[PDB]
Amino acid sequence: MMKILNSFSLKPEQRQTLEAAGHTVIDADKLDDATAQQIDVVYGWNAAATRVNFDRLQFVQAMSAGVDYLPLAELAKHHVLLANTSGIHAEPIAEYVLGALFTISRGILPAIRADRWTLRQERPPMTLLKGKTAVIFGTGHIGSTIATKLQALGLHTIGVSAHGRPAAGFDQVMTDVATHEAAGRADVVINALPLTPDTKHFYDEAFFAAASKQPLFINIGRGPSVDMAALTQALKNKQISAAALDVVDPEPLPQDSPLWGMTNVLLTPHISGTVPQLRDKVFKIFNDNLKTLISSGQLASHQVDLTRG
């Protein structure tokens, strides 16, 4: 029997489902100071998930694949169990990256912004994807899925993890020391790195220099993992032909940004990690990890390494 803090607006069936196994469901807005100390589980996170008793708190179910907005250091000192939603976000992000490959590579971008038929003005020099090297930093579920879907379209994939272990949908996997070697061979670069001290400004000034073949850079990972002055610059000087920035640093990207009036920068407002029927596909992971904890005291799936993020 648990006390679950609803910080992600449970459906009337899911709530109604939870309340039977002996688990009191509290909406964030119905949380008082007394009850906030009696919280066991937190389904999601907001301003009503900071007030909860961490010394009692056992499990937290994040609503995203990252965990870089949570008090990790608090949770890892309490050793509070954290489940993300990693991998349900893989398939749409790998459809978004392909959508952010064609839009740029086939002049769909340098069209859609152009005002509102005569194609007399020179075409944007379009690039076919088959025979090109798509370098992918991060060899997690998201990275492997994109690497499969690019191997199909006939691309030479190169995974870049911490160690350089063989992963799925990759020809060769390299180490994060050979980052400039991956960038140097790249015709496409794909940020799928979680935000850690190391990865904080990993796509800085230095990275884009090794990148000689002016590669199409894709930001579906995190913004702060990119240095935006060092991105913005590397663009203007054709050190990377185009980019794809699903995230930014800060987020949102502000009203001035030269990325605005640029003409090879695609700017979507954190939509790559979208899932049709999300509440289900998180409550599933949430609701598998709620009962395994009660029985054993662990998580069924998606257990976050609070140190690595």
List the helices and strands and how they pair.
Elements (H helix, E strand, L loop, with lengths): L2 E4 L5 H7 L5 E4 L5 H4 L4 E3 L15 E3 L10 H6 L3 E3 L6 H16 L3 H4 L21 E4 L3 H12 L5 E4 L10 E4 L3 H7 L2 E4 L15 H4 L5 E4 L8 H9 L6 E3 L19 E2 L11 H18 L14
Helix pairs in contact: 4-6
EC number: 1.1.1.95
GO molecular function, one term: phosphoglycerate dehydrogenase activity
Pfam families: 2-Hacid_dh_C
Structure in words:
This protein has 309 residues and is of the alpha/beta class. It has two domains: 3-86 and 276-295, 3-Layer(aba) Sandwich (Rossmann fold); 90-266, Rossmann fold (3-Layer(aba) Sandwich). The protein has helices spanning 12-18, 33-36, 72-77, 90-105, 109-112, 141-152, 179-185, 207-210, 228-236, 278-295, and strands at residues 3-6, 24-27, 41-43, 59-61, 81-83, 134-137, 158-161, 172-175, 188-191, 216-219, 243-245, 265-266. The strands form two sheets. The chain has a seven-stranded parallel sheet, with helices on both faces. The chain is elongated, with a radius of gyration of 22 Å. The relative contact order is 0.14.
Any descriptors?
pyruvate, 7-stranded parallel beta sheet, alpha/beta, Phenylpyruvate reductase, Rossmann fold, EC 1.1.1.95, 309 residues, 28% helix, 10 helices, 2 domains, elongated, NAD, D-isomer_DH_NAD-bd, 5-stranded parallel beta sheet
